[PDB]
Structure formats: C-alpha cells, structure tokens
C-alpha cells in the first residue's frame, strides 16, 4: 500500500534520483492542504450511515425494480448485502481521501469487482447509480459551513469527486 508521498518516493526511486526542490515544495503545499483533508474525512466518517441509508432510499425509490420479487435486492439477505456493499465503497473512498492517492481504493476494492458483479448477475449500472448518489450526498455533506472556519476547498472536493467517479467508472 502506498500513501500520498509513497508515490513520490516510489517514482523517485524507480528512477533513482533524489527529490528536487520542486517536489519538496509540492509536498509542503499538500501538507498545508492536509488540515482541510482531515476535516473532509471527519465529515464523511461522521455522517456515513445517513449517506448509505439515504442513498439506498433514493436508489430504490428512483429504481423500484430491485425491491420487487425477482429483483436483485429481493430478500433480506440480498438487501443487507446491497447496503453493506455501499458501506464498503464509502469506506474505501474515505481511505483514498486520507491517502491522497487512489491506489488503496483500486487495489482493495475496485480492481476485480466488475468480474464478481458480472459473475452474480448484478446490474452494474444500478451500482453506478448508487455510487453517484453517495457522491452527491457526500459532496453536499462536505460543503457544509457548520462548525468549520470558512475557506476555499474546491480542489479537495474535486479530488474526492474524482475518487467517487473512479468507483462508478470501475463498476461501469
């Protein structure tokens, strides 16, 4: 597993040079961003259960297929598996939001996931709609002006959106 820097160091050793002053300035910049990063991850880790639950409500409301007999989310077993999978993807997007690299989220969750949800008959695009709903709820939760000093955080919301867009892109 590689962190935000571990990628810089790993490339710098894959060429075997030192870090230039340019690289060190970039790292120092990301550190000064890092408090805002921890704030976003704290907001996500707090309200996560409402993210998963509300997003699943909107999924089954907007697509009434899966709650019906014959649908894929039809059994209490299958529904619990559905919600828990949404909890999985939100957990690893929280991880890759902390790391600054999308490596851990690829390697643990996204890489290979499509082969499974093909192998079960699960419609991938419904999963993609689910992850888009968690992206909407999560970004609209991350832009809350409650309890935090005001400030500009468009770049980190852009990055977080890149992680959820990678999840929806990897299931579909």
């Amino acid at each position: 597993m590689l962190d935000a820097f571990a990628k810089v160091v790993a490339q710098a050793d894959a060429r075997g040079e030192f870090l230039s002053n340019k690289q060190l300035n970039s790292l120092e910049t990301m550190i000064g961003e890092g408090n805002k990063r921890l704030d976003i991850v704290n907001k996500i880790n707090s309200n996560a259960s409402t993210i998963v639950t509300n997003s699943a409500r909107a999924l089954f409301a907007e697509q009434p297929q899966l709650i019906q007999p014959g649908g894929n989310a039809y059994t209490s077993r299958r529904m619990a598996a559905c919600l828990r999978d949404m909890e999985i993807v939100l957990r690893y997007v929280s991880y890759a939001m902390t790391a600054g690299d999308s490596s851990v989220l690829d390697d643990r969750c996204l890489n290979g996931l499509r082969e499974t949800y093909q192998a079960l008959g699960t419609p991938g695009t419904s999963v993609a709609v689910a992850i888009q709903k968690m992206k909407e709820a999560s970004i609209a939760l991350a832009n809350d002006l409650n309890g935090v000093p005001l400030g500009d955080c468009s770049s980190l919301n852009s990055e977080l959106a890149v992680y959820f867009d990678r999840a929806a892109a990897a299931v579909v």
Binding site: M1, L2, S103, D106, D107, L110, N111, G112, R166
Partner: peptide
C-alpha cells in the same frame, strides 16, 4: 496509472 493494474502488482 489511472486504470486498474494487473493481478497482484500493487500499484
């Protein structure tokens, strides 16, 4: 490195 890497092969 945007896409997923080969099996094993941790990115």
């Amino acid at each position: 490195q945007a896409d997923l890497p080969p099996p094993g092969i941790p990115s």
